[PDB]
Symmetry: D2
Subunit: 99 residues, 4 copies
Amino acid sequence: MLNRVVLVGRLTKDPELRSTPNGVNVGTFTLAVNRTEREADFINVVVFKKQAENVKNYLSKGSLAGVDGRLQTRNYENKDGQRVFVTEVVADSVQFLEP
Amino acid sequence: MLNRVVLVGRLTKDPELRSTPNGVNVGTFTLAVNRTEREADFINVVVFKKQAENVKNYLSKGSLAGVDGRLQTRNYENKDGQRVFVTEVVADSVQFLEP
Amino acid sequence: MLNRVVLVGRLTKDPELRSTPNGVNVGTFTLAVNRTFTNAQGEREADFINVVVFKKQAENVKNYLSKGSLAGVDGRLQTRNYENRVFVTEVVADSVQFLEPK
Amino acid sequence: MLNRVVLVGRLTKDPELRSTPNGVNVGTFTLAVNRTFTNAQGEREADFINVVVFKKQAENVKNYLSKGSLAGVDGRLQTRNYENRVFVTEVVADSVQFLEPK
Ligand SMILES: O=c1[nH]cc(F)c(=O)[nH]1
Ligand SMILES: O=c1[nH]cc(F)c(=O)[nH]1
Ligand SMILES: O=c1[nH]cc(F)c(=O)[nH]1
Ligand SMILES: O=c1[nH]cc(F)c(=O)[nH]1
């Protein structure tokens, strides 16, 4: 079913790459998108494979970047017995616009 | 900054309209979007004003509906001393497709 | 660079299948996507976007979609021109949602 | 019905402002939006979408945007035709992000 998200925002931290038990890389950053008295929303992005590593190369805290992807929800149990409901954006592609 | 979300999914419950302290209506439903071994993500939608009331009229649990909007994050403290981080989709428009 | 298009419309004619010399299928319909917002005259307008799908999907749109089918489209917007130079724009679909069983 | 377009490109020429008889401004540029994905020949392609903005925004795009400016666009896709009947498609922008200070 149609599920589409396009974003331009700035990374809050540096991208965090980590290596999965299957052996494939998984990227993590947060995009801060000023809303178009100014507030910004903070979407969490997830990238995989080739795209994931590129973001570790070129993107860093404060980089302006564009994102095209699908919007996903997962749930897990955190370090204690609590159920975290997460919503995030898995990026089909990630465009480096300006630092 | 660019922030755009388009979705087609099915309502999980019936839409919940409620009336705000300012006097304006605020709509609430959850959209279940099968991903294009089938899983679905559950995005929470928010509508306001005219659009909000329409969804109470015409949409109900299981209605297939399309959504165009922006992606927003808010935080609050829940009934106990816990900080809920929420991400949701405020709908610029809501299209009734099929029940 | 970012380039994305989401659309819900009804097909004006029936879908047209063709094959490239390369061996890959190419589906064709044009969508009638009513505007959600009324215009200054208070009347309701429609745009007619031309969609293109490729490979396996093109066969599915040929199988299940027909004139008047309600359908969703996710894709990018592409511009080409060729000789009698005609300026064409249409929507190459990454995916196509059939919003009707028929 | 859903109809949405997001784009990031560079302007090919400088923005063109005009005014309607109604008194409302209408901005014009065309964007060059490089494809993110390479083609079968391994070369990089670009689409040239024509954008339209209205009212106050049109003046801002005229003020700050110029040929080669990197810019973001959020809007819908509209189809019109008129007499010498020319088939035009372009992107009426709900909003326009200036991705460069210049
Ligand atoms: O400012 C932030 N808010 C929320 C986050 F998840 C984050 O990384 N940074
Ligand atoms: O199945 C559901 N998951 C999450 C929700 F918030 C909801 O309302 N329904
Ligand atoms: O109703 C229509 N108007 C214009 C077209 F090109 C078409 O296919 N159908
Ligand atoms: O490089 C260009 N190609 C085609 C066009 F219409 C244009 O404006 N610029």
